[PDB]
């Protein structure tokens, strides 16, 4: 699903970054698409079921 537009310090089309959320994989942090501490968009909160 979409997530809610957060903010970005980077010029963004904040209408459309709500498609624009990391894939989610299997439940560690960030839903497995990245082992750092913040990634550039937030994950997703439904991630541990989906
Ligand atoms: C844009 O990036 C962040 C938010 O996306 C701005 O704020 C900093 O966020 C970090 C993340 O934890 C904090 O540690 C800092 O204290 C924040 N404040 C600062 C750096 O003043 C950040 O200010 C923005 N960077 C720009 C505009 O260059």
Excluded: C
Aim: charged residues 15%; negative net charge.
């Amino acid at each position: 699903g979409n997530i809610v537009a957060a903010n970005l310090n980077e010029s963004y089309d904040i209408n459309t970054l709500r498609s624009k959320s990391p894939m989610q994989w299997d439940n560690s942090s960030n839903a497995g698409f990245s082992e750092a501490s913040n990634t550039w968009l937030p994950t997703n909160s439904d991630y541990h079921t989906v």
